[PDB]
Amino acid sequence: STSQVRQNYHQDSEAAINRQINLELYASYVYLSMSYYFDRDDVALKNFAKYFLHQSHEEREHAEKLMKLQNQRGGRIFLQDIQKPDCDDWESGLNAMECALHLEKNVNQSLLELHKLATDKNDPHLCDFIETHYLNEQVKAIKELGDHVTNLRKMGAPESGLAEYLFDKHTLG
Amino acid sequence: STSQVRQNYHQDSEAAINRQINLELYASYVYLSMSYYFDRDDVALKNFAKYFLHQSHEEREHAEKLMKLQNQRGGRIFLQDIQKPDCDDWESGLNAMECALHLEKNVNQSLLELHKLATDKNDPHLCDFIETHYLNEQVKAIKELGDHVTNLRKMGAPESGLAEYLFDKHTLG
Amino acid sequence: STSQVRQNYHQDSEAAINRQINLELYASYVYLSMSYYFDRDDVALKNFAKYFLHQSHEEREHAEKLMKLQNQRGGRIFLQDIQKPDCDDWESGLNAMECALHLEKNVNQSLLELHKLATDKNDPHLCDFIETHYLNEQVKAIKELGDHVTNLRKMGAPESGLAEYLFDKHTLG
Amino acid sequence: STSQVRQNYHQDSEAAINRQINLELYASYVYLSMSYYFDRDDVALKNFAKYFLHQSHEEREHAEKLMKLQNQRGGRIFLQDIQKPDCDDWESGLNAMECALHLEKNVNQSLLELHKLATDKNDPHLCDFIETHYLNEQVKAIKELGDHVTNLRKMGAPESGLAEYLFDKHTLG
Amino acid sequence: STSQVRQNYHQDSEAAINRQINLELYASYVYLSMSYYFDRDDVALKNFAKYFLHQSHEEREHAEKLMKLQNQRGGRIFLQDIQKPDCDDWESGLNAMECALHLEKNVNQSLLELHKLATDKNDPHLCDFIETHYLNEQVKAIKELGDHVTNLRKMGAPESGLAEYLFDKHTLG
Amino acid sequence: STSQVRQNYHQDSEAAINRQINLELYASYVYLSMSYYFDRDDVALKNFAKYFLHQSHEEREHAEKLMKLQNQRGGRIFLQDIQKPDCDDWESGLNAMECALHLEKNVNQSLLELHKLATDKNDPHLCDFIETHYLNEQVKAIKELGDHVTNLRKMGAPESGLAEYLFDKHTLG
Ligand SMILES: [Mg+2]
Ligand SMILES: [Mg+2]
Ligand SMILES: [Mg+2]
Ligand SMILES: [Mg+2]
Ligand SMILES: [Mg+2]
Ligand code: NA
Ligand code: NA
Ligand code: NA
Ligand code: NA
Ligand code: NA
Ligand code: NA
Known part of the structure; x- marks a missing residue:
């Protein structure tokens, strides 16, 4: 039953990786929803x-890299349903950015818990994997989203539709 | 409530498009599972x-094009859960190819029903969208998968592991 | 007696590095033996x-990098005999691949023990060195060897000399 | 009061980062003094x-990277006075190299204490940041300075002004 | 005790140069603080x-050029502590620009006093050094900062966060 | 038992080749030790x-060429332990060069005895192999090492650390 490649890879770590895969696919789905909300004619x-x-x-890429990791370590991928996002209508550029920030912090928290588990199970390869490929990416993403939210609020979003228009042009364009 | 762009776009068509989006995302998820099954060390x-x-x-791209369609017509995207695939373990190259063929035919059938609905609602734009971007793609995909299955079976898959090895190299490589 | 550069480098870590150098040189020697076994006319x-x-x-390179590390930290290299490999005759491509897999897992285990020691001695530079340059290399090597072994067995190695021939051509060639 | 981006970032870590910023700016100032000592006509x-x-x-760059980190994590930079260096006159190439070595080891010790704090506060992002950007840089710098000091002493510095002249030309030139 | 190169270089001029070096390093530190204030997520x-x-x-460069001057003339550099800047929080783009303008005018005044001393000590080399490298630089910097402040105020900074946003984009970007 | 390719290849020659392989690997190990001795910070x-x-x-390459020879002739490689070098500390550039010279002369003597055996067994292929690939290489290496030793001694090595420094720069650099 044990993979020929498996070494120093705890069942709890394998399970936590499967959970993280699902979370990354979920985040991908949330961002897809937000994107096409902003593509609406209204x-x-x-x-x-x-x-x-x-x-x-990018989130889908993160999920696939975790799947690759799972196979590299001799764990087995078990996929679960990807839940639909919490909103169909994201209301505004600012609200979408705030929800993205909240999502990214939730993903980061899950990654930190995964790192804690890896550390507890004395899995330095997994810890380094999380550090190298995920934790700094999360910190940068959170910082960028925070910068965006700060700018939008100072510009007068979301009541100033001019604010979101000019932000779309000058920051995101 | 009505989109300013909406014209000749029936509610039933909008709903059928949302269903097709979900089906395309599901197919994407199935293929992701199969891919990483073949990435296993065993x-x-x-x-x-x-x-x-x-x-x-490619299936993800198809879903996104349907979402773009929905917004172009002034319909509203409503996402649903993406169900996990039917299998974790796809057993063999041949079995995976057969399941892919079955999936593609199911997607094609849904597209045909969508076309029938479009036709019944006198929506030529939607009809030609389906015809141009989806139906031929499906026919080609089904033909390719059928060719693959035929070759694998004739080679002696899945009991001849040499068969799958050489197919992997010479057809898919 | 203390090196002018030495800082936060425990004697036990220095000794473990010397052991790892020897193990890497040993692995290099094993692979050399296997290579020239496959170069035999029979x-x-x-x-x-x-x-x-x-x-x-590659294993020689790993050893030299450990020697460089030893000098960087102000430890002193003490070389030992490089034991001859366990076999002169590796019997088959599959058997050689399995022995390589076993060897790589043994090297990985030694590296994990070294990381554990570094962690216990609060040597983050050494831990990061092992993580960055060795642990992922080992995981990839083990995964690749496992893939090779799986393919050979499915192809019918080692009794099917055609199997090894075609593997040599299409995977390793 | 809490930054919107702040997550898993302890006040003690924030304070230690501010101290490290000051130390890096101090080291930059020391090196500036040494440089212009060697630019004297005598x-x-x-x-x-x-x-x-x-x-x-380079030390200035290290300080700025720590400031960037502080903002990335949602901490707040608090600058302090940069103390003047201990010497105006560094006496000789060898003496300057020895003082540089001592300084670099002090900086390294501070970084190791910072890593210890990060580890104790379960901050893997901060630990990885220190490991990736600082610890190996310090080890290399210490090794290089030690090599320089060794060469100067063997050449006969600082009493052999020919020694320093030829070292300046052939190693540093 | 007298440098072999020293000629027509008064002790008071040497001391004034050392003071100017410190002031330039201080200005560099102020600008560093302001920069990383604007890098905050909020x-x-x-x-x-x-x-x-x-x-x-640029201010660091000015300081280093003064140090080079000091050595060229055969004076001796004596460094002092670099005081921390007056603020940690610069409040706004406009406020930072006004503080920068005030700082630059203070630096300019010190340069003018230095020139006056040079003139009084009949040091034409020093006078032309100041004129060539510093005074026009200062005039330009003061004019630019004044233009910035004028624009920000007319745009409605600092209460109009849109003002600072668009200034950041169109003038400074 | 006899290789299908074996022709005019005496068992004594096969054994002597195996001994030479070991000696070449030993020489490689000695040089590795010396290299990393000179990489020490002191x-x-x-x-x-x-x-x-x-x-x-280069010595590793020589060993591998002998292994290739062995297989070309239809002999069988039998590896032995590679003994650790005689010293951990090579004391000086001059002492290392003298030990290298002594080692190269020992290798040359073994090659000459191998040639004598080949000649006695009327093995012209083996003789010309040794002549073409090894004997001149040895003569050149011995001459170069002798030149190095002569220069170091005349320069004043090993007591003149300046000697070794300048030799390192101008001859070996
Ligand atoms: Mg504008
Ligand atoms: Mg074939
Ligand atoms: Mg790490
Ligand atoms: Mg010279
Ligand atoms: Mg003039
Ligand atoms: Na992610
Ligand atoms: Na499709
Ligand atoms: Na290795
Ligand atoms: Na530094
Ligand atoms: Na200035
Ligand atoms: Na040789």
């Missing part, structure tokens, strides 16, 4: 749409 | 894995 | 020979 | 001057 | 940050 | 280190 913020579509594809 | 068919990963990304 | 698998020769040189 | 070792000026700029 | 004006970082590096 | 002669590392790799 919202029409092309660069918001592009930004979130880019994030969606 | 299966180790790199070109099967690559082939199915390519199909997964 | 075995004659040129790409097996090339593959194992590449691995031999 | 010392006139152009390549010593260039070497230490390069080190000064 | 301020997030990337081009303000870049502008002030550029100014910081 | 020795710090980078070009000595590079020179001996080059020699180490």
Whole structure:
């Protein structure tokens, strides 16, 4: 039953990786929803749409890298349903950015818990994997989203539709 | 409530498009599962894995094009859960190819029903969208998968592991 | 007696590094033996020979990097005899691949013990060195060897000499 | 009061980062002093001057990267006075190299304490940041300075002014 | 005790140069603080940050040129502590620009007093050094900062966060 | 039992080749030790280190060519332990060069005895192999090492650390 390659890879770590895969696919789905919200004719913020579509594809890449890791370590991928996102209508550029920030922090928290588990199970390869490929990416993503939210609020989003328009053009464009 | 762009776009068509989006995302998820099955150390068919990963990304593209369609027509995207695939373990290159063929035919059937609905609602734009972007793609994909299955069976898959090895190399490589 | 550069470098870590150097040189020697086994006129698998020769040189590189580390930290290299490999005759491509897999897992285990020691001695530079340069290399090597073994067995190695021939050509060539 | 981006970032870590920023700016100032000591007409070792000026700029870069980190994590930079260096006159190429070595080891010790704090506060992002960007840089810098000091002493520095002259030319030039 | 190169270089001029070096390093430190203030997630004006970082590096260059001068004339550099800047939080783009303008005028005044001393000590080399490298630089910098402040105020900074956003984009970007 | 390719290849020649393989691997190991001795922070002669590392790799190449020979003739490689070198500390550039010279002469003597055996067994292929690939290489290496030793001694090595420094720079650099 044991993979010929498996070494120093705890069942709890394997399970946590499967959970993280699902979470990354979920985040991808959330970003896809946001992107196409901004593609609506009654919202029409092309660069918001592009930004979130880019994030969606990036999250899918993160999930696939975790799947690759799972196979590298001799664990077995078990996929679960990808839940639909919490909203169909994201209301505004600012609200979408805040929800993205919240999502990224939730993903980061899950990654930190995964690192804690890896550390507890004395799995330095897994710890280094998380550090190298995920934790700094998360910190940068959170910082960028925070910068965006700060700018939007100072510009007067979301009540100033001019604010979101010019943000779309000058930051995201 | 009505989109400013909406014209000749029936509610039933909008709903059918949302269903098709979900089905395309589901197919993408199935192909992702198959790809990483072939990436397992105890299966180790790199070109099967690559082939199915390519199909997964292509299905995602199909879903995104349907979402773009929905917004172009002034319908509203409503996402649903993406169900996990039917299998974790796809057993063999041949079995995976047969399941892919079955999936593609199911997707094609849904597209045909969508076309029938479009036709019944006198929506020529939608009809030609389906015809141009989807139906021929499906026919080609089904033909290719059928060719693959035929070759694998004649080669002696799945009991002849040499068969799958050489197919991986010479057809998919 | 203390090196002018030495800082936060425990004697036990220095000794463990010297042991790892020896183990890496040993692995290099094993791979050299395997390579030239496949170069025999009665075995004659040129790409097996090339593959194992590449691995031999890579292991030598790993040893030299550990020696460089030892000097960087102000430890002192103490070399030991490099034991001859366990076999002169590696029997088959499959058997050689299995022995390589076993060897790589043994090297990985030694590296994990070294990381544990570094962690216990609060030596983050050494831990990061092991993580960055060794642990992922080992995981990849083990995964690749496992893929090779899986393919050979499915193809019918080692009784099917056609199996090894075609593997030599299509995977290793 | 809490930054919107802040997550898993302890106040003690924030304070330790501010201290490290100050220490890096201090090291930059020390190297600046040494550089321009060697630029004096009565010392006139152009390549010593260039070497230490390069080190000064590098230390400034290290400080700025720590400031960037502080903002990335949602901590707040608090700058302090940069103390003047301990010497105006560094006496000789050898003495300057020894003082540089001592300084670099002090910086390294501070970084190791910072890593210990990060580890104790379960901050893997901060630990990885220190490991990736600082610890190996410090080990290399210490090794290089030790090599320089060894060469100077063997050449006969600082009493052999020919020694320092030829070292300036052939190693640092 | 007298440098072999020293000629027509008064002790008072040497002391005034040392004071100017300190002032230039101080200005560099102020600009560094401002830059990283604008890099905060709750301020997030990337081009303000870049502008002030550029100014910081330029001020460091000015200090180093004065140190080079000191050695060229055969004076001796005596470094002092670099005081921390007056603020940690610069409040706004406009406020930072006004503080920068005030700082630059203070630096200019010190340069003018230095020139006056040079003139009084009949040091034409020093006078022309100041004139060539510093005074026009100061005049330009003061004019640029004044233009910036004027624009920000007319745009409605600092209460109009849109003002600072668009200034960051169109002037500083 | 006899290789299908074996022709005019005496068992005594096969055994002597196996001994020579071991001797070449031993020489490689000696040079590796010397190289990393010169890489020590308290020795710090980078070009000595590079020179001996080059020699180490060259000796490995010589061993591999002998292994290739063995298989070409239809003999069978039997590897033995590679003994650790006689010293951990090579004391000086001059002492290392003298030990290298002694080693090379020992290798040359073994080659000459091998040639004598080949000649006695009327093996012209083996004789010309030795002549073409080994004997002149040895003569050149011995001459070069002798030149190095002569220069070092005349320069005043090993008591004149300046001697070794300048030799490292100008001959080996
Ligand atoms: Mg505008
Ligand atoms: Mg074939
Ligand atoms: Mg790490
Ligand atoms: Mg010379
Ligand atoms: Mg003038
Ligand atoms: Na992610
Ligand atoms: Na499709
Ligand atoms: Na290795
Ligand atoms: Na530093
Ligand atoms: Na200035
Ligand atoms: Na040789």
